[PDB]
Symmetry: none
Subunit: 98 residues, 4 copies
């Protein structure tokens, strides 16, 4: 129901997993979306607003920074890197799914 949803929803944010889909399938940050870096710009730009709070993580920090930079170069105004990726996330007991 809509009320149900309205309840769950500061501003909207989205978590992007830029690793390969297969890796995503083995496990990812809960709610994160699979957008392999190869098609990141196209998939991100076609589905989100440039003002969306976006949290990104790849297999390493270099891949994470490449992705973050790509998004910004594509007009995204609020992109942040998730240092440590999935590993650091799991270390603070962050929810994951597969």
């Amino acid at each position: 129901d809509a009320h149900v949803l309205k309840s769950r929803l500061e501003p909207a944010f989205t978590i992007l997993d830029v690793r390969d889909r297969s890796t995503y399938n083995d496990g990812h940050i809960m709610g994160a979306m699979a957008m392999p870096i190869e098609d990141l710009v196209d998939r991100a730009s076609s589905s989100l607003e440039k003002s969306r709070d976006i949290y990104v993580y790849g297999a390493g920090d270099e891949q994470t920074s490449q992705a973050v930079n790509l998004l910004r170069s594509a007009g995204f105004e609020h992109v942040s890197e998730l240092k440590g990726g999935l590993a650091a996330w799991k270390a603070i007991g962050g929810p994951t799914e597969l």
Copy 2:
């Protein structure tokens, strides 16, 4: 530690919760740009299945809304036939959402 706690306070202390959810706006992008449900992602019906399949788990708790109950229902049918286990539509669409004071963006 307050004799009477606010529901909001306890929710913030909780570590656990229900599954993540995703809101899909299946209208065209130009329409999406003029105004959509906050947090919703643009996945026009034309490439909905492909875009949904590549970015989400077939178990993702999905909520969809389109331009009219027929288009909303179409999105529901497309995803369920693609194997998505938890697809729900937003009855009334944007109107029902604005009616209940739902947050929107753009």
Copy 3:
């Protein structure tokens, strides 16, 4: 399972107590809440919890909720808080539930 996960999940500790009837609890309760119907609340809470544990309690209405809080406090429990509005208030703010 590896405790690292659990340590990672884990402040200080707190427990949520649902004092309504067990059948009511089965139809839906705050996620993580434990079923301790008011009729045996004191005995169950006392045997499973320590008196210093932060406890959040909610019942079906104002009377049952306040009664529960009073039973625990007069039983020696030090940190009991009335979860204002109980389940209904919780649902109203999109709070997680289980059945």
Copy 4:
């Protein structure tokens, strides 16, 4: 930073419950933080009456054999998610797991 993000999530994993199956007096001298006293003797009845069969349960007793015994008593009762805390209290404190009394 994973913390600001983790703080903003409107979702998460299921609830978990830690059960200390040693006797109550032992529990009183120290137990895992948030854990609860459900001695072996009343484990099944106490757990069944206060928790849902689907609760993600973590158990620890005095020695791996008592722990494993507790886990099987719960599973045989229909509990769907029960895990042993191998090495018990020692292993828990070993990794810095919080405790209380």
